[model samples]
Target: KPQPIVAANWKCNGTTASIEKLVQVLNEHQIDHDVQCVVAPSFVHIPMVQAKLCNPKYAVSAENAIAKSGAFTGEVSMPILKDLGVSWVILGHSERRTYYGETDGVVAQKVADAYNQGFMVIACIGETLQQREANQTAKVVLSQTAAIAAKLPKEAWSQIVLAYEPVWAIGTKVATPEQAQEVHALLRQWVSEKIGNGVATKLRILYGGSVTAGNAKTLYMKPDINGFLVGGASLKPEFRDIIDATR
Candidate 1:
């Protein structure tokens, strides 16, 4: 059976002092052996957070990665991330795609770059509320997945974790767990068909949006749902509860 993986996407929140306290709280919790814990801090905090979690039981991930190295000025590259002990990188988050105009092709290149540098990737794909209402959710998400899959070699598929974060639910407080599971199941089906049964079965497809401890169990109970790629809640003490709920 595939192990459940719970990842905390801290985004651009929290100060140094706040993060230190958050880390202390996380360390105090009894993480379930069956659950793999990953935390993504901002670019500036990767090394600091990584240094504190040297144990293999937990992992630290980079929130984003640029496709190339050197002189991008403000960008972080896969090489730098690898050097900083970052094992995973989150790509194509809705925020990046919508706010920064990141297309599927661009994210595909980033994914390839990360894989080439031996960094695991949590490749995100999702659609907006209007897309869902217009019945274009699967088409949009699958197109994004296909774009990335086209750039990836079969061997590299194992290094990827797909996070299905619906655009509408990301930072909203009104979304329901049932809505998240529907898209997650659809995404899993698309993976099974596009990437083959073995890889699909092994791939850890996670739900990300406004995932909280109170609603985590509802989504976790779904058969195709493996875990979560949490956002806001990840920055607070509630993150540990979401981790425990996966068990």
Candidate 2:
């Protein structure tokens, strides 16, 4: 139901001048019609970055947003993002869960709010080293997903993308395609049983964490890896090659 997505998660990085250069370089690449491209710039740079890329195939996304609009200091809300013309939001990123103390329930609330507001979501789920070593990877990610799944409507599944970013691999390593595929396949199986085959068949499960242009093509070839949630590599000119992989 959906095409492959090549997403750039420029998490808390990129200076003003640097982002301009990056946007200029990204504009030069010709993306395939069958692929969808999204770039999440720091909230401060969204307007500048959004205006730079005039391609309809490419969309600007926000890194995170709060569920409701209120007097919450130092927070951006879904309505605010909508006003800014942002169409997508990435929730439950590892950094948010680890560094910022976002729990499963909080992420699920964020997901529900985004979906309810008509925003697309890239809800992240994964296991840390301790969990993986204990053979609890599936249990961990599934429980994380269950939280979001319980809050979202069945129809919302199509508007959401699940990114499996193994914590150990975020910056230090890249999961072999085999490792990523195994978990992705497991996610599909769980979705089939919990949500239904229709949603499972259409859901796009992305592989994030240390996704470089060099390895994107092989990862894209994996049956369950519909696309990526690229990190450091998304900030460079080589990001063009990662987008080109779908072509």
Candidate 3:
């Protein structure tokens, strides 16, 4: 298995971003080398932030990358991301899947393209509130993952990090330790059945919903939760506190 990770997704919160938060993350020179760090600023902010945070300990990530390199206008394609020196991409996020109508097949195409073109992917997958209510959580996420899994060969699994962010829990509730681990374990078994136990064993899985320093350690202690895909908390200094949770 590889080192665990913590990736910051700086959603559309802009214009009023606090200098204090940026200062705090900037001043955080001490890092846990055993863990991997990724920070994703808004597309417009990537170049500046990437320049400011200059350590091998971490790298910048594009929130999304297009599946193809042609005339997709506002979309940033994989080649464009390469030109920007972005080594990672976060695709299939709940927000994109919900607000933008991104589907499983679309996510699969992007995953296949990114992996083939040599970019590490933090691939997001999860079910909604109604899906959970109907006892279709497993069916929902497993099917989502199966699509992406089918698009890639066995060797590409290592380059993918799975982030399970339930649509209901995001910005609303947090999954209890039991609920989180249960889904994680189920996903691992699902992947093991789809691929093999070896790849599934080494594949990194993360919990993204309502993850905070207060509850982070408890969540991280779960065998299946290798790291976090932090949202709101990632913009604050407490993002550092969450990082310490794994160490």
TM-score of 2: 0.97
Looking at candidate 3, what is the lDDT of residue 78?
Answer: 90
Residue-by-residue lDDT tens digits, candidate 2, 102-166: 99999999999899999999999999987888999999999999999999889899799999989
Top TM-score prediction, candidate number: 2
Best by lDDT: 2
1 or 2, greater by lDDT: 2
**Count of clashing residue pairs in every prediction:** 0, 0, 0
> lDDT (CA) for every model shown?
0.84, 0.88, 0.85
Estimate the TM-score of every prediction.
Answer: 0.95, 0.97, 0.94
Writing each residue's lDDT as its tens digit, candidate 1 over 121-204 gives: 999998887887899988998899999999888889889999988786555546667777787778777778877888888888
| Full ranking by lDDT | 2, 3, 1
Decoy 1 TM-score against native: 0.95
The CA-based lDDT of model 1 is what? Answer: 0.84
Residue 132 shift from truth in candidate 2, angstroms: 0.4
lDDT of 3 by residue, 1-247 (tens): 4588988888875433563357346556577458888888778888777766765668789889896788777888898888878889999999899999899999999999999989999999999998898999989999999999999999999899999997877656657978999999999998888799999899999888888889889988998998889999987888888888888
Better of 2 and 3 by TM-score: 2
Residue 89 deviation, candidate 1, in Å?
0.4
